[PDB]
Structures are given as C-alpha cells and as structure tokens.
Design a protein around this ligand. Structure first.
Ligand SMILES: CCCCCCO[C@@H]1O[C@H](CO)[C@@H](O)[C@H](O)[C@H]1O
Ligand SMILES: CCCCCCO[C@@H]1O[C@H](CO)[C@@H](O)[C@H](O)[C@H]1O
Lengths: 442, 42, 99, 62, 49, 424, 145
C-alpha cells in the first residue's frame, strides 16, 4: 500500500527564496500545529583568530539577554508567555538561534529572531556577568573527558589552523574579550548573505518570506572590501596528543584520519562504512550477537565501556574515525580490533555487511528527520553547506549506488596507509605508540 | 539502531545556567535497547 | 534383533561396569562443554559423581558389583536435549557467517 | 595536474603489499645481475692484465 | 581550561611541503610516503641480495 | 511544499480487548509499539525487580527466534528494538523502513508472546541488572524520584523501576514466565503503529496477538501514605523533592495540576534564560543568590498522582531554597494568582503538549498511553480545549490540596541543612 | 562494617536511630559507604582535638592504685580547648524500611522515653522487664514475659 521508495517521493520539497540583501529563506511545510524557525549563520570559531577566539560563544551567551526593543528579560518573558522555546548552539563553522513555537505564533517568532540577530544589546554589565558564567562552563567542560578529547583531537589534527581552536576559546580570551571585540565580530560575520532563515512545520513558504521581507530586510548585506571573512584551507597533521592522567578511572581515546569535507560524494560511502563498524556501550542489549565485529568482540571480551565511529565534516576537510572509553588495560586491544576492522573494510568489505550498513544509514537518515526541529536544522545547515536541501530521494540514490567495491575503494582512499591524528586522555600508559598505530593503518 | 544515543553510558555542574533544566518535573521512564544506549528520563 | 546386539555391545563396551551412563563417556568438544554447562544442577552434580566414582574404580583397576552396573534399559540421554540445541545454535551462527 | 616520481612509485608499486612485494622481487633480480656485473667490471679494471681471464688467451687453444 | 592547551609549533621539524597551514597536506602525502617506501623497498632488495 | 494525507488515526478494539491504532503518515520508516500494563507497580514484595530484568531480556531466545537471530535479523535491516517502562506500563517498540515491518513485527511478537526465558540465558543476564542500574543511578534525579515514590506509597507505585540490589542474580525464569503470563494479556495491551497501514496492523494483531485472561492480574490500588527518605551522600549539591498526593490521570483535577505546574515553572524555555515567568524560580531567586534550580513536579498515574516541586541547591542553602519554593506555593493557595499568569501557564502547557507529539516517538507514546489508560483516543483539539477549561479557582484549589495534603519527601546529598517535612 | 552488618539487629538498630532523630543520636556507629576512603587526617586530628579533652574524659582503673591513676591524669590528661558540648539530640520520629527478602523480618518500634539518670528512666527500665527483656532460661518459654 506504499513502498519505502514511494514514501521518499511523497516528501514535500523544501522551498527556497532569497531576500534582496542576500538572506536565504527556506522552509518545509507539514501539517503540524507547531513549528521550528531559526537562523543559521556561517559563523564559528573557524572564522576567529587567536585574538578573538571565543567571541562567537560569548555572543551566544548574550543573544537572549535583551535587545534594544526588548531590554533585559523582556525577550525571555515574551518567548515564555507564548509557550515557545528559544535555543542556540555554536560549532566551529556554524551558529544557530531557533525557536520552537505554535505555528500560529510564527509571526512573533520571526520577529523575535530578527530582533535578536540585529538589535542585541550586549550591555556592559551583562558582558561582565557572562564572563563569569563562561569561565564556570569552561571548568565544567574540563570534567567531560569526551569534550576534552574531542577538543584535543582538533587541536592536534588541525594544529596551526583556525580549526585547531575550540568553540569556547582559551580562558584568557574569555577574561579579556571586550564589547568592542564582540561588536567587531558581530558586524563582520552576521551578514544577510551568511545567514539562512529556515522553518519547518505548519506554515507556508510565502508567509515565511513575507515575514522575512518585513523583519530581515534591514540586515546588512555588505561589510567593507577586506571585511568579507573567507575560509582558507586547514592543513591536517598526522600526530598525537596524550594527556596522561592516571587519576581518572577510564581512558578516552579518539583517533581520526582526514575526511573529505561536507560537499564530497564520498561521505555517503564513508557513512555506510562507519555504520558497519557502528557504536556500542555497556548497556546495549545485543552483546555477543551484535553484527559489528568490533561491538561483538568488545562486548564478549569486555574491552570497553563504549565506542562510536564518527564523520565530522568541515568545509574542505574533516575527521573520520572513532572514539572509545575503556579500562587502562584495554586500550591496546581496542585499538588493535578497531584498526583491524578499518583494514578489513578497505580490503574485504562483503556485500552482505555493506547492505547492512546501507540499511542502518537509511534508517538513521529518516529516523533523524523526525520532528520540526531536526528538519529545520537540516534545512538551515544544508543551505549553508551544500547550498541546497538534499532530498531523501537523492540520499537514497546515493546510498543505493554504494556496494562492497565502493566501500573498499573509498575506505582505502581515506584509511589505508594514511596518517591519523590521535588524542588520548586519562590512564593512557597503554595507548600504543604512534608508530605502532600508524603501522596499524596498513 | 543506526543512531547512537546522545549520551553513551560508562561506569558536573558549576553554575546556575548549566543547572537550569536539571530539576525533575515528570515521572521516570526507563528504556533499554538492543542497538542504542539505555536512558532514564525525568 | 539389532537390539539384541545393542544390549550385547552395551555390556561389552563396559562403561556400565564403572557405573557410568553413556553420556558420561562422550568426548568433550566445545559443543559438549557448553551443553554440560547448561545442565541443571542436579544432573550436573550427578554426572560429576558418576565420573569421580568411575575414575576411582579405574585407578584401582576394579569394577562395581554387578547389581550396580548401569543397565542398558535404564540408560537414557540426559545430555541430548541440551547438546542438540547447542549444535543447532552454532549451525545458525555459521549460516549467518556464510552470508 | 602532475604527480612527482615518488608519488607515482607509491601509487603503483608501494601502496599494495602484493605489488610492493613484486617490486622488491623483480627489483632484486634486475639489481643482482647489474650489481654483480658492474662490481666485477670495476674489480677486473682495477686489476687489468693481472687476472687469469686476462692472460688466459696466451696459453689456450687446448 | 583544557581549551588553553595548544599544540606547540613544529615548523622546525616539518617537511617543507607541509609547512603551509593553509594548504592541504594530502597533495604531498603520496610523494612523502613513496619516498619512505622506496628506501624500505631498496633496503629490502639489498638485504635479499 | 504541500504536506503528504494528512490522514487520521485509525482505531480498532478487537473482541479480546486488544486495541490497535495506526496512523499512516506515508513516512519512509515505520514505528510499532506494543504497550502493556506491566510496569513495576505490578510487582509484589516477592518478585521485585522482575519487570526490570524483563525489560533487559528482550533479546533472549524465543520459541520462534534464537537470541542470535533476533539481534542479527533486526540489525540486518538496520532496525531497532527497545523496551521502555514506567511504573505502570511497558512499551516494546520497533523501528524500521516500511518495507521491513513484517520482519520487525515477527521479532516483536516472539519477544512479547513467546519468550522461553532459558535458565542459562536468564542467569547470564543478571549481571546486566547491576550495570543498567549503576548507569541510571549516576543521575541524582533517578535516586530522588525512586525514593520519592517509595516514600509516598505503601505499595504498587512505591516500586522502583530498577531491581533492588538484593534481587540481582535471584530473579528466576519462573518469575519471568509468571510475570509475562499474568500481565501480557490481550485486555492489558495496545498495538500502536505509525507509518504502516491499519489493515495489516489489524491482520497481524488478529492472527498473532490473542491471549485470554484479557484483563489479566492487575494490582491493588496504590495507597498513598506519605513519608520521607533522606539519602546522605555528601554531594556538594542537594537534590530534593516535596510532594503531596494530587489526582489520577484522566480526571479533571489532573488538568488543574498540569496548569498549576506551569504556573510554578516546569522547565526552561530559554537557553540560559532567567525563567522570568516561572513563579517558583523567581521566588527562590528573590531569596537565594547561590546557584540553584527548582521545578514543579507532576506525576499522574491511573489511580493516584504526585504533585509538588523539586529543588537542586548547594548543601548549605537547601533549607532556604525549599522553604522559599514552598512559601510561593502557599501564596498561590492563598488566592494570589494573576489571570495573566494562568494564561501564560496554559500557553506553555498547550504548546508543550503539541511539541511532545510532533515526533513519531512522542506521538506513539501519547497514543499508546491513552490506549491503555482510557482505551480511547482524545485528539489534540480536545486536549487543548480541556486545558482552556481549567479555571483559576481550580489552580488555586490544586495548590491548596498540595499545601494541606500529607507530604512525601526525598532528598539526597549532604543533608546537614535540609529540612524535615515537619519543619516546613 | 560488613562484619557488623551481618547481624540484622545492627541494620535495624542503626536505622532505628536514623529514623528517630534529626541529628546527633541519628548518626551511625559505622562509617557511611560514601565516606569510606574519604576520611582525612585533618578530620581525625580535629575530631580528637575537639573531643578528647579533660572535661570530657574519665580515667577508670581496676586493680591499679588511685594515686597513680591520679598522677597519670594530672600529668598527661590535663587538656583543654575542646568543643564539653554537642548539639541536643532532637527526637523526630519516622520509619526506615529495608526490603531484603530474608525469610525473617526484624523490626523495632519505639517512642522517645527518658534521659539516663532521670527518675522516669527507672520506670522505663522496670517497664522493659515487665514486658520481657531477654531469656532467663535456656530454651525456656519465657513464662513471665
Ligand atoms: C565378536 C563377535 C560378536 C557376536 C555378536 C554377539 O551377539 C550376542 O552374543 C551373546 C553371547 O553369545 C548372546 O547372549 C546375545 O543374545 C547375542 O545377541
Ligand atoms: C566453548 C564454546 C562456547 C559456545 C557458547 C555458545 O553460547 C550460546 O550461543 C547462542 C548463539 O546461537 C545464544 O543464543 C545462547 O544464548 C548462548 O548461551
């Protein structure tokens, strides 16, 4: 009564319009009485210099603290009283501010976002308050070994480049960044041509466009001649960073090879490969019967508490690899099996496992785009990265093209005899020497 | 399944901002999975 | 009568003279070791004692009084259901491995 | 649009282990012949006229 | 903060072809690996001889 | 573009009592859940923790599929099988691309209707109870909320979602078979589907889902008692919850409490915001300059409910935060309640309810929960109307019921300055 | 602690005091599990300095002369700067139920009575023996209990 292939075609196309100032407006209409609307910006620590690294994160902390039109908690009270939710997030390349609200409140939602993105107060006393909150959050992040090891992995794999920088910035910058630094950062990156107004839910594109024309037209579409921030390529460096701390109970290790970058077609076959190796943690019910050899071995031999493969993408590079948490006596075994599995895929992926990978990736894609928020973000981010919304029907075609041969060739291209970036934190005396890890890549 | 849980299990707060949302407002739910990390809500 | 020859063979084999049951004499490969592990406590403890008693008799180069020899008609397979399942499970895994 | 010598050697002969192995093999055969002949030539030149092979003609025809 | 941790400069040790941080190192990885594997290969032929 | 329809929810109550409900959203993936009244409230003091092990036993061997085939077969199609429990229900849910629903459905049926609970598999699984509990208990809220219920009730709802430690390694196969046979019965179940046609879901239920004794062996009425459990553990932060018995889910008084919860504050609306419109947060802040958090707590069940608030503060400030939060509730109970407040609460509640069902998971859970609690489906339209119908006097009376009701309390952390119920 | 806790009475009597008092007397004789490995040297020094003081001590001897116990106390036990003091135990009332499945249930039910040394304390001591305070005959039927 409807094949999986037909459900793909039934997905409403994403509508894309553009304002005179360069701002893109995109939406996916559904029948939901709620929606998510927000602004995605091509701004992130990758655009920051050693000097103002942390600026973007600082702004995120002030973004909802009051605007010129709605000073102090006024903005907050408006969002709350209509039962909406206002959230934000900053990564190394993108920033986003978005609202979840009743579809009927779309007008007030679009207004509030416009207000936030253009009339943010950045009061001096609030900047001093946030300075302390951020310093506290830095201390909290220090207790998250996962956060720490991923920041280290970036710091070493992209050493000497803007991608080596963390999103939050060094504590000394949090202490010295000034309103001037922030206003400078904002005026330079928050430009209409670098923003996408996205929305998903029970709303029509024309209405969103209407609201966009009304509230974002004044948004600047220019910034000097030497203002236009441009990303330079970020060199990847095979290397290792080890923060030995025997006082911690478990070791965290993250290892990655340089990935292709967002726009590259290879990402699909790489996601299929990562889906084959998969993820795992001590609470999974499959145990010894898990399809992934790594998960299976890990479970029966109790080699780790958890592990996850990942494909972190940036403009023209990325981190393709895995992260695992284990006992100090299991690091070597984990690394051995993990690398063994990468080599197995490069040289012998079988059709049956690649078919399992494809199916997992199909299920991941669809189950992920469930709800207005995930869809809205996919719209915002896709426009910024691909420059278009890639339809599920297209994703299916790209996945369908992947077979054992493609997995072997694509995995060989990125893993086989390539230098990895390695980050370790905790009781890591048993983390293999870099030469051994490197030899394990072939 | 294919999607990994937001937080992987293994066996924070230093400011109010990071504390907001921690207070429980609803009854507990416990989930176990074959392919995904366990979770506890509320 | 195949059964005539069977009872004759059972007694000629002679593990019954050591008070053993046929399953007590099976060569323990990995399937068998798993089946034994799955045995309920009483059957497991019984197997252990019959083997201990047999090894002890063997050591003394003695056998049990004839009235205590395991009888052909009474020897039943206590291991079969567990071992059959262990073998079916392994065969299943191998099929999936071949895919 | 052009790879250097080593980058070319890597892709064709060094990346695969089977090819890397076959490169060393044929490498060894071609190397042995040329090394031995070259080395011998140097030796015989350093010792021109002193070796049996050099004065042998004066006594042969046997 | 762990974010105060920055990898030290290694420019003094880097091969010339990976000195530019605004250029991808993949463009030279084949050459860089080929060299090393030539040495290895030649050492192997010399030892086999 | 124009949405895919939007079709309506199809309902069907079979003769045996089993409810089937499906909504075709024409989505590429399906989601099927079998909801059962088998939550931990149905355990008695002799088999505590049985439903927890049961929740962990979904991949054990069944009469129609070995443990190995369940895991490999579901992973082969990239699917998912999970088990969720609350104190009243258990929900077994599978996810997969729509072409593979027949496969997931057979595994789901085997797991829920044909478990074998083999002695050796059940024994080897017991350690998992310890791992699963330790992970859950790393959350102080889990400790507090479990203790809260144990303090509030004499039985039933007092049971933990997690196996008591003394029971780990002692849950028997006969106990599991017993539990499944007594509660996994047709009149205590609902098969809910999303992205699958109602006809097939119905044919599946008719052909593979019958099991008389329909109503099954439910349990005694939850008896509210009141009391307090204090867990000293020296954490720099004290987590505490204070509640009174409120109202059974489905009753009108329940809505008044939902609105009261949103008048007081039921969670953040703005990232790092100051919760300007949260009555409890603002009251506490106006008296505590220490870091803290507070939230209204609302737990509604089939035959009872718990309402109050939950606080998180530094150990030294526990008593100030708790007392300030409590005094704010007393004032509402005193009649001091703006209509503009109630209106804001209703907006939060109505918007929150709609957002909670916009994803397949939330929707399935909502339909699944209604199917079991009221054996019927109230659409959002009606729920919203029901929220609007709540009067300010109702909210004030809910508050008064809380204030004058015998309290239940649970706290954990360094309790040197955490008050006892009688000091409030 | 594990050795002491093998006795159900120990569990019950410790929980009884924790249920009866808000503080002071509510404290267990056994270290809470979360504190094991965390008791510091400074905590020990301070505990000894605050409570091991002359006014909080009694030196009792059997088969030793009073003169020497006295000389010992005068010369080595003249210590001040304590805390004689301590929060007044505040009776509260409550109940702690520990489910553990033992075939036997151990339970204690009490109410606040009287401070030792008071006349009311003697009434309770007598009441205790009216009710029954332990066996007098091996395997007897406690006829007078
Ligand atoms: C090595 C020769 C094997 C012959 C088969 C044994 O056959 C057995 O022999 C017994 C004693 O004669 C009989 O009592 C018994 O009925 C008969 O089946
Ligand atoms: C020495 C060899 C040990 C073999 C252990 C087999 O173990 C069995 O494997 C089955 C998979 O088909 C499982 O379904 C079953 O629960 C498990 O006990």
């Amino acid at each position: 009564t409807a094949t999986y292939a037909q459900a793909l075609q039934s997905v409403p196309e994403t509508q894309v319009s553009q304002l005179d100032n360069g701002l893109r407006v995109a939406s996916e209409q559904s029948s939901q009485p709620t929606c998510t609307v927000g602004v995605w910006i091509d701004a992130g620590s990758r655009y920051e210099s050693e000097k103002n690294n942390g600026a973007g994160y600082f702004v995120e902390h002030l973004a909802f603290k009051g605007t010129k039109n709605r000073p102090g908690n006024a903005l907050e009270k408006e969002v709350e009283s209509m039962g909406a939710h206002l959230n934000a997030y900053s990564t190394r390349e993108h920033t986003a501010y978005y609202i979840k609200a009743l579809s009927k409140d779309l007008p007030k939602a679009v207004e509030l976002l416009a207000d936030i993105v253009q009339n943010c107060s950045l009061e001096d006393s609030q900047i001093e308050k946030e300075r302390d909150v951020i310093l506290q959050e830095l201390q909290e992040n220090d207790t998250s070994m996962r956060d720490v090891v991923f920041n280290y992995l970036h710091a070493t794999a992209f050493q000497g480049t803007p991608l080596a920088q963390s999103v939050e910035g060094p504590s000394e910058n949090v202490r010295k960044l000034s309103r001037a630094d922030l206003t400078e950062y904002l005026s330079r990156h928050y430009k209409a041509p670098r923003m996408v107004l996205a929305a998903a839910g029970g709303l029509e594109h024309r209405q969103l466009l209407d609201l966009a024309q009304k509230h974002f037209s004044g948004l600047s579409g220019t910034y000097d001649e030497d203002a236009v921030p441009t990303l330079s390529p970020c060199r990847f460096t095979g290397s290792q960073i080890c923060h030995r701390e025997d006082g911690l109970p478990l070791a965290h290790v993250a290892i990655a090879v340089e990935g292709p970058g967002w726009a590259h077609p290879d990402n699909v076959a790489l996601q299929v490969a990562n889906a084959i190796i998969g993820h795992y943690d001590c609470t999974y019910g499959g145990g010894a019967h898990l399809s992934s050899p790594l998960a299976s071995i890990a479970a029966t031999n109790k080699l780790c508490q958890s592990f996850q493969t990942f494909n972190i993408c940036y403009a023209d590079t990325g981190l393709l690899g895995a992260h695992f948490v284990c006992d100090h006596m299991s690091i070597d075994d984990m690394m051995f099996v993990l690398q063994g599995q990468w080599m197995r895929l490069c040289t012998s992926a079988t059709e049956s496992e690649v078919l399992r990978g494809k199916n997992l990736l199909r299920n991941a894609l669809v189950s992920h785009l469930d709800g207005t928020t995930p869809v809205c973000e996919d719209i915002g981010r896709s426009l910024l990265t691909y420059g278009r919304r890639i339809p599920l029907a297209e994703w299916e075609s790209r996945i369908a093209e992947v077979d054992a041969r493609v997995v072997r060739e694509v995995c060989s291209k990125y893993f086989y005899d390539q230098c990895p970036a390695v980050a370790g934190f905790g009781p890591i005396e048993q983390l293999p020497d870099y030469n051994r890890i490197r030899s394990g890549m072939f | 399944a294919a999607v990994p849980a937001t937080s992987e299990s293994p066996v924070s707060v230093l400011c109010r901002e990071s504390l907001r949302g921690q207070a429980a407002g609803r009854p507990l739910v416990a989930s176990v999975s074959l392919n995904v990390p366990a979770s506890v809500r509320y | 009568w195949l059964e005539g020859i069977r009872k004759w063979y059972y007694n000629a084999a002679g593990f019954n003279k050591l008070g053993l049951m046929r399953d007590d004499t099976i060569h323990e490969n990995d399937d068998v070791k798993e089946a034994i592990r799955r045995l309920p406590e009483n059957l497991y403890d019984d197997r252990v004692f019959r083997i201990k008693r047999a090894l002890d008799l063997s050591m003394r180069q003695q056998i049990l009084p004839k009235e205590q020899w395991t009888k052909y008609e009474e020897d039943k397979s206590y291991l079969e259901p567990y071992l059959k399942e262990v073998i079916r499970e392994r065969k299943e895994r191998e099929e999936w491995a071949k895919k | 649009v052009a790879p250097t010598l080593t980058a070319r050697l890597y892709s064709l002969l060094f990346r695969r282990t089977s090819t890397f192995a076959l490169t060393i093999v044929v490498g060894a055969l071609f190397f042995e012949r040329a090394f031995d002949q070259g080395a011998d030539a140097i030796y015989e030149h350093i010792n021109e006229g002193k070796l049996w092979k050099h004065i042998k003609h004066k006594y042969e025809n046997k | 903060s762990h974010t105060d941790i920055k990898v030290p400069d290694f420019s003094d040790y880097r091969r010339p072809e990976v000195l530019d941080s605004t250029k991808s190192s993949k463009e030279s990885s084949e050459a860089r690996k080929g060299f090393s594997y030539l040495v290895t290969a030649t050492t192997t032929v010399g030892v086999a001889y | 573009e124009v949405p895919p329809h939007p079709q309506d929810l199809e309902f069907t109550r079979l003769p045996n009592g089993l409810v089937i409900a499906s909504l075709e959203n024409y989505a590429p993936a399906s989601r099927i859940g079998l909801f059962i009244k088998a939550g931990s409230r149905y355990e008695n003091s002799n088999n505590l923790g049985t439903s927890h092990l049961l929740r962990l036993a979904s991949s054990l061997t069944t009469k129609g599929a070995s443990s190995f085939k369940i895991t490999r077969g579901i992973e082969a199609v990239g699917g998912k099988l999970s088990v969720t429990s609350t104190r009243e229900n258990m929900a077994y849910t599978v996810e997969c691309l729509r072409d593979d629903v027949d496969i997931l459905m057979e595994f789901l049926l085997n797991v829920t209707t044909a478990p074998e609970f083999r002695r050796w598999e059940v024994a080897a699984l017991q350690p998992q109870l310890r791992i699963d509990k330790a992970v859950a208990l790393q959350n102080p809220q889990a400790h507090v909320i479990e203790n809260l219920h144990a303090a509030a009730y004499r039985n039933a709802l007092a049971n933990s979602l997690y196996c008591p430690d003394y029971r780990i390694g002692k849950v028997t196969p006969v106990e599991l078979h017993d539990y499944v046979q007594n509660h996994f019965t047709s009149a205590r179940m609902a098969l809910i589907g999303l992205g699958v046609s109602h006809p097939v879901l119905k044919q599946v239920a008719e052909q593979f889902l019958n099991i008389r004794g329909g109503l099954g062996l439910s349990g005694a009425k939850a008896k509210y008692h009141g009391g307090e459990i204090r867990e000293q553990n020296g954490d720099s932060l004290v987590h505490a919850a204070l509640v009174a018995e409120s109202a059974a889910i489905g009753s009108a008084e329940a809505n008044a409490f939902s609105v009261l919860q949103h008048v007081l504050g039921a969670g953040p609306h703005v990232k790092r915001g100051s919760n300007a419109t949260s009555s409890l947060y603002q009251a506490v802040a106006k008296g505590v300059h220490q870091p803290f958090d507070v939230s209204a707590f609302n737990a509604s069940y089939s035959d009872s409910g718990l309402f109050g608030f939950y606080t998180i503060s530094q150990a030294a400030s526990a008593g100030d935060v708790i007392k300030a939060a409590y005094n704010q509730v007393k004032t509402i109970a005193q009649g001091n309640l703006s209509n503009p407040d109630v209106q804001a609460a209703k907006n939060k509640l109505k918007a929150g309810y709609l957002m909670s069902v916009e994803s397949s998971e939330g929707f399935l859970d909502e339909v699944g929960s209604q199917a079991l609690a009221a054996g019927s489906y109230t659409p959002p339209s009606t729920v919203l109307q029901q929220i609007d119908a709540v009067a300010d006097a109702d909210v004030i009376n809910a508050a008064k019921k809380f204030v004058s009701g015998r309290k239940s309390m649970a706290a954990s952390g360094n309790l040197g300055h955490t008050p006892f119920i009688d000091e409030l």
